[PDB]
Amino acid sequence: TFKNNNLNSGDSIDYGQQRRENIGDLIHEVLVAFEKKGGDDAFINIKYMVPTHESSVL
Amino acid sequence: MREIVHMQAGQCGNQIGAKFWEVISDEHGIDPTGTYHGDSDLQLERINVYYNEATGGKYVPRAVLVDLEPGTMDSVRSGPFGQIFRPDNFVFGQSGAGNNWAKGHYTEGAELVDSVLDVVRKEAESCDCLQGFQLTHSLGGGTGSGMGTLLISKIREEYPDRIMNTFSVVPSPKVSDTVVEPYNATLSVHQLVENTDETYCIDNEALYDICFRTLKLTTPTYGDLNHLVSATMSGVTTCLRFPGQLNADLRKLAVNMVPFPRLHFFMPGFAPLTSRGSQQYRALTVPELTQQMFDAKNMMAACDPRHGRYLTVAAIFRGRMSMKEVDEQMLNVQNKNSSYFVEWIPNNVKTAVCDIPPRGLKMSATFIGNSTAIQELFKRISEQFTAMFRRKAFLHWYTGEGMDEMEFTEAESNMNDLVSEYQQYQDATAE
């Protein structure tokens, strides 16, 4: 639901990129950490839940 | 291919429209089962105007039936030519207005106008051209007047450009037929002025004398009364359904009569009228047909155009005849009775001619008049309204049904203003 809720600021510095309050960013490395420290049958389940995601280990 | 939708409201509207569908099914060859058994193809040639086509040969009417009680529609369904109507077009309630305009317009007709509007919207989107609407009701009843005027208001809100016709069975000067007729008529005319495109004020007493003197007939019966009314409607509408040398539809009729927007109250007239046993002495000519039109005793309202002044006259000759006889008779009747004609409208008669006379008739002729004499009807209604409203007769019903007295005062003011403009255009001169 909240995967694509990132900041479309254009060419503008995100000065709040130290408190880490961007859900659209945070979900991405949550999924990357899941796929990395998951297993062989992890991309199929993650792709089954969220259809946009694609593998970081391929 | 120009379709019009027919609505009937109240007892009078239901019986009159039932007779109307009976006669216009007879002239189109539609049997009571709903199929077609006509002689020539001209009967079904323009059948799309009044009938929708079902699967097979079924031709259902383009009609909506409204009454707050099953009642009169129950009688119509259990009468002849009652099986042609779709059962989904019978919209009815449970209570029934007790000749109460407030009940028919605010309390009982309020929670039925949604169903009637859905039926009307469906049956009108089933059309292809949708020339307009015609409604049969009386200005002397509860659901005839209040629910009918509510329907007119909502339909003008929905479709603001279509032609609206009302057939407006007005209260009679003699007898009563209802004791709250001044209230009902004053409240309904106030809606009819600002929401109807053309209105044929029809009087029971005038129809009584027409049916009993010019037709003898002894016992007249509402079958023949409503059939005279239905014959006038057929003569009005016929240029949609049959070809002619000079055709004229509802919009031509309304443009060529109505001079100013709040002057669309007419007097109808059907003028082949032969008493029993005088057809042998009848000559059956165009001058005699026009003379039977332009006779004051042949009007279907109590008002006297000889007392008043004609503004616009529409004559539709439905049958085969000559432009010679027709045009010269209109010119002669105008030039002889130039006293009963406004001088500021030169040759204030529209002429239409069809080609198909009634079955069993050689020629027919419908008469519509827009004289200033019709102010007498509103004067009668307004004076009876004053006599009741001064002593607050029967007003506790209208006030207890959630409706105030300033509605009555505004309705009376509008009717008196209508009489004022009618008298102004009567006595206004050319130069």
Binding site: - | C129, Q131, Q245, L246, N247, P259, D327, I345, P346, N347
Partner: protein
Amino acid sequence: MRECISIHVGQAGVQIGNACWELYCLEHGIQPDGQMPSDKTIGGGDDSFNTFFSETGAGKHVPRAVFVDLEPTVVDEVRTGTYRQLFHPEQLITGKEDAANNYARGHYTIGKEIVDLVLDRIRKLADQCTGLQGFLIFHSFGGGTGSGFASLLMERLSVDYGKKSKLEFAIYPAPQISTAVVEPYNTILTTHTTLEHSDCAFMVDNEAIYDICRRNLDIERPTYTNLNRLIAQIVSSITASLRFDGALNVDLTEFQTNLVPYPRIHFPLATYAPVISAEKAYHEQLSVAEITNACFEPANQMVKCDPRHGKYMACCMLYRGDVVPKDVNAAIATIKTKRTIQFVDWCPTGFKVGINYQPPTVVPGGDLAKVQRAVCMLSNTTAIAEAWARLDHKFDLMYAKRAFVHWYVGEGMEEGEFSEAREDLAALEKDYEEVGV
């Protein structure tokens, strides 16, 4: 190559087109299916049909006509019955809702949905021609489509074409006879477009043709059919010089150059006047001088106006049949020596004579006699000012009290066009009264 396209607008135009294309089909020997009758091939290279009819395939002729209405019937009546296969299905164009005797409906609301379609049909029929003589528009002033939509068509035709000649035949309201009440309003509103989108304006009064039918043809209750047959006879006599070969004869440009003195004065009067029944034709000297005098009589005009109250500017006399030029010159001499007929001082030679070899043909079930000599006089005079004055008095009488204006204003035209058209007709009246003296 002398084709001219006929447009028939309104109920009056459509009925006149029926009575006119009947006459054309019998004059060219064509059955009401496009084809010639059985074993009645044309032969002899007769190219007379190649002005009103077009070869499509294997001896079929389509008319060069566009029948327009805004409503069904009449056009539907001729689409279904007798002359069913004669016309192309896409040239009898009809609408759904009529213009309701309203110039505003005919010009602004219902007019702008079918005008492009009939213009495209006109363009296709013009492309089918190898050089077009002009257009013949037929309408009544009357109400609705005959005024508003005819105004729209003339307004677009004058900017599309304009090297061609547009002759329009208008059924003018009578002095007292009328089948409507807004005829003065519609006729006033269409005066401007008939002033500035037409080249010749042949105009007819229903009451005058009624009187001619009652007096000459001896029929006592005429319908529209006899009047439309007389209009068809007039138009046939006008275009018979283009159709058939003969003696010295005029064209649609020879006529205009010899008729109209000024661009604003283009409102002549048409009188086809060997009009009689056969029973009285047994007892008449049907001679050239007699029929010329019958044309010049004030009681044989198709507009209820007295030409003795005006001065003749020019007259184009179209003769048909066994007609030599010398008795035509004798008739012109007698007309000149007549003192009742007066001519304007700046037009001394006021006659243009065109003689054609083909006599007119009677339709079966008609009322005209089969005469061997026919004459149509097309005369520009100042007597049409009486019709203008009658129209203006009726319009002023209605417009003083602001009657029926709400229909036009609600349907879309602004208030000022009424006064603008009244001023236009006042200017035309001033022009005619100035040029008369």
